[PDB]
Structure 1
Amino acid sequence: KFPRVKNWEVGSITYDTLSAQAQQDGPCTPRRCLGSLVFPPEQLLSQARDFINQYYSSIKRSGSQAHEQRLQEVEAEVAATGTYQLRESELVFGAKQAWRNAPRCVGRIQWGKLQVFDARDCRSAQEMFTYICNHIKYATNRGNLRSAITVFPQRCPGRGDFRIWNSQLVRYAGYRQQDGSVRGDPANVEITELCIQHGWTPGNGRFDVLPLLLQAPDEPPELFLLPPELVLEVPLEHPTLEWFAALGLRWYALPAVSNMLLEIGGLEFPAAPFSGWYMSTEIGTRNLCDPHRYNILEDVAVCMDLDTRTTSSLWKDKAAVEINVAVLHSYQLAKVTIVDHHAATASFMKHLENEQKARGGCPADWAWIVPPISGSLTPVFHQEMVNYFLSPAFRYQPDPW
């Protein structure tokens, strides 16, 4: 009943006893595995009680006095209001745990260090924008990036919700044409029409930072331009390919995801943007080389005078590696925090071992932990993993529209 988990590079064995605690059901059954799929009243009180028990056991003071006082508080709250309020220390612990529980996050070795910005007193899109801009400024920190989450008001009955319509705080525009192609980021094609629809006058470059479409409960979403000096970008150059700079490639410093829902003890925060720093393959391999993203790999290969006529020259691989080199060099040159996939996966291995001792296991999504280049060159490739859903958790959620 406790899955055996082996590391095939070292031969070491552990058992995931944490998987027993799995809150919610994943997509898999004994008949078929769907691990590779991207998107796989008194209920409130059972989850709330679960979380409080978690919390007090984690500070060692469960069973004891403040524990029961807190439980009867939440009981009375929900009886009075239909919902309840997290203590600020519970929100902090809940945000950290939700990060610590994220199976697809390779950066979780950092989970203890997270700046939680309590925006639960937020009203209006204009205040959200101020919280968000403060977040961006704090997290960017002139390039020495610091992990942060800003928690906007929870969903409540009868009332609408705070939503950030943008998937991330920094998103480059994607424009179609009557030639069908996209200029800019094909991923953001949709939020770009939405920004234009809502009044944004579009740029026409490959790296036009989008406005933020912030939405207050029931209110239409309001367009907000981000101060250029707030949005730190890194122009991309290569240490030895001097023509690489001239490709005009750039990316932004701050990976700040703003469309996921934070769930803590049955409470749901549909707006809680969090940010860390980038792993270099996210930019250099996925964002710039995905066929359905900037898809620049053949451009770079042409500039390297590679033989793109045959797959077997591995021109795709050589071009991809040099784009990742350019990303690493360019971020380092700009003194912007970045981590390469070897360092990050080596740290995740440490995280796995710490979590094995800390709580008997760690939910990890192998397909997402293994980097998108040089998979088996990293130690996570040889690490068996168990994927399960613990709470508190970050969850995907429907789009607001």
Structure 2
Amino acid sequence: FPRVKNWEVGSITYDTLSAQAQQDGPCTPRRCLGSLVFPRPEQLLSQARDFINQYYSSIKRSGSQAHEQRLQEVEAEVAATGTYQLRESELVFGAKQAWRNAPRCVGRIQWGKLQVFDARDCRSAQEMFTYICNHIKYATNRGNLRSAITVFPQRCPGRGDFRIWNSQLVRYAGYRQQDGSVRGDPANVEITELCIQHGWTPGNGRFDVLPLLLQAPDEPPELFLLPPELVLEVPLEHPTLEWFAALGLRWYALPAVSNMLLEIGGLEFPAAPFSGWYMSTEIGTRNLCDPHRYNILEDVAVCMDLDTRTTSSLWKDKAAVEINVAVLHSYQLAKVTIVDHHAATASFMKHLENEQKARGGCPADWAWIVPPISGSLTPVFHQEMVNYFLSPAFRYQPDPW
């Protein structure tokens, strides 16, 4: 049982929960690989017992009448069909629990508040598009963002798969040149290469919202134009730097992740987009200032008349911070939910405390919980963490080609 210390306060806890890790991680006694982003059939019933057992534990209902009962239909379902369907209440328990278990998510204090839309009866490409469009509208909710997940049918053998080819529902295009450089977003150049390679009209500039490539089983992806009034976006201005708005910067409201595989009770949903609300450092620090993203830090510093000729002026730092100020200011003005990294990390500490009493610990990926600016100014920096894999879970999955 690993001893975990908070160095700001001196408190000690033990992560007893780590004793239940399933799909093992990449670290060995001889080398740690925690900084890697991507770490390297009669047994469907094993991890299916597991989940049902977890479900009935929570609701004060382990070992009696109802718990005994639900254990049988699943074995009989898999004995008959080789797979099984989840009760609606289980699908919601599994959606939230998988969120609770996401080690890289700093927003887990919200894990109990989740809206689960059950698209397990989906049928075609036009079908998911309606399911996804209901999602965006509901999640966006005019800027009062509401966490949601839309769960499409569980994969079965012999036939294809529902899969959203976009990494997110809202993603900006990226346009090359004779010189390879990108107008727009370089994280979305490949998918842009496919979206054009499927009929779409590539726009002019930097913040063109990409269309959607949705994949009904076995058939080629169908493009789907997203209705403009569905895609809520925020123009970026600064509270005191009047020229910031003239830079023409924009970001979208809904962070809606559509490429991860939800796994509950041994079942696998390759299309299950979840969405919450942004933390501001995501947009301002990573999306706008990463050197392989919009990479605007130097342009903002020029406009602030900063001395970019020596690193010791901390011009990168000063410009980065005002970018984050502008992100927060703009979103709050447009009345769109956003959380600064100080507020977010302080809530995660409260979540860690809640999980200690609830489950005896919490899986947490230190490198992803500490924000990309001002890390030691947040409490999670001084908090030791244990990272392991619990089920149910969100997993990474290969790109569908």
Give the alignment's TM-score, normalised by structure 1.
0.99
Residues 1:13 and 2:28 aligned together? no
Q: Secondary structure at the match of 1:172?
A: coil
Q: Deviations over 1:336-362 (max 9, x none)?
A: 000000000000000000000010000
Higher mean displacement: 99-108 or 200-209: 200-209
CA distance in 1: counterparts of 2:230 and 2:238, whole angstroms: 25
Q: Secondary structure at the match of 1:150?
A: strand
Q: Deviations over 1:264-319 (max 9, x none)?
A: 01000000000000000000000000000000000000000000010000000000
- Percent of pairs identical after alignment? 100
Q: Offset of 1:14 from its aligned partner?
A: 0.3
Q: Deviations over 1:5-31 (max 9, x none)?
A: 000000000000000011111000000
Q: Secondary structure at the match of 2:242?
A: coil
Higher mean displacement: 195-204 or 222-231: 195-204
Higher mean displacement: 58-67 or 29-38: 58-67
CA distance in 2: counterparts of 1:270 and 1:24, whole angstroms: 17
Q: Deviations over 1:126-155 (max 9, x none)?
A: 010000000000000000000000000110
Q: Deviations over 1:58-89 (max 9, x none)?
A: 11111111112111100000011110000000
CA distance in 1: counterparts of 2:220 and 2:81, whole angstroms: 26
CA distance in 2: counterparts of 1:309 and 1:377, whole angstroms: 27
Q: In structure 2, what is the equivalent of residue 199 of structure 1? A: 199
Q: In structure 1, what is the equivalent of residue 329 of structure 2? A: 329
Name stretches of at least 5 consecutive residues in structure 1 with no aligned partner. none
CA distance in 2: counterparts of 1:357 and 1:175, whole angstroms: 50
Q: Deviations over 1:165-187 (max 9, x none)?
A: 00000000011111221110000
CA distance in 2: counterparts of 1:245 and 1:288, whole angstroms: 14
CA distance in 1: counterparts of 2:35 and 2:65, whole angstroms: 45
Residues 1:286 and 2:277 aligned together? no
CA distance in 1: counterparts of 2:65 and 2:188, whole angstroms: 50
Q: Secondary structure at the match of 1:72?
A: helix
Higher mean displacement: 127-136 or 39-48: 39-48
Q: In structure 1, what is the equivalent of residue 33 of structure 2? A: 34
Q: Offset of 1:42 from its aligned partner?
A: 2.1
Q: Secondary structure at the match of 2:188?
A: helix
Q: In structure 1, what is the equivalent of residue 263 of structure 2? A: 263
Q: Deviations over 1:25-48 (max 9, x none)?
A: 100000000000000132100000
CA distance in 2: counterparts of 1:75 and 1:69, whole angstroms: 11
Q: Secondary structure at the match of 2:237?
A: coil
Q: Offset of 1:190 from its aligned partner?
A: 0.4
Q: Offset of 1:201 from its aligned partner?
A: 1.1
Q: Secondary structure at the match of 2:387?
A: coil
Q: Deviations over 1:208-239 (max 9, x none)?
A: 00001000000110000000000000000000
Runs of 4+ that moved beyond 3 A: none
CA distance in 1: counterparts of 2:207 and 2:23, whole angstroms: 39
CA distance in 2: counterparts of 1:135 and 1:82, whole angstroms: 31
Q: Deviations over 1:82-140 (max 9, x none)?
A: 10000000000000000000000000000000000000000001010000000000000
Instruction: Give runs of aligned pairs for residues 211-290 of structure 1, distance below 5 A.
Output: 211-290=211-290
Give the alignment's TM-score, normalised by structure 2.
0.99
Higher mean displacement: 254-263 or 199-208: 199-208
Q: Offset of 1:159 from its aligned partner?
A: 1.3
Q: Secondary structure at the match of 1:277?
A: coil
Q: Secondary structure at the match of 1:243?
A: helix
Residues 1:113 and 2:113 aligned together? yes
Q: Secondary structure at the match of 1:169?
A: coil
CA distance in 1: counterparts of 2:300 and 2:377, whole angstroms: 23
Q: Deviations over 1:242-261 (max 9, x none)?
A: 00000000000000000000
Q: Offset of 1:204 from its aligned partner?
A: 1.9
CA distance in 1: counterparts of 2:365 and 2:382, whole angstroms: 13
Q: Deviations over 1:186-215 (max 9, x none)?
A: 000000001000111111210000001000
Name stretches of at least 5 consecutive residues in structure 2 with no aligned partner. none
Q: In structure 2, what is the equivalent of residue 378 of structure 1? A: 378
Q: Offset of 1:368 from its aligned partner?
A: 0.1
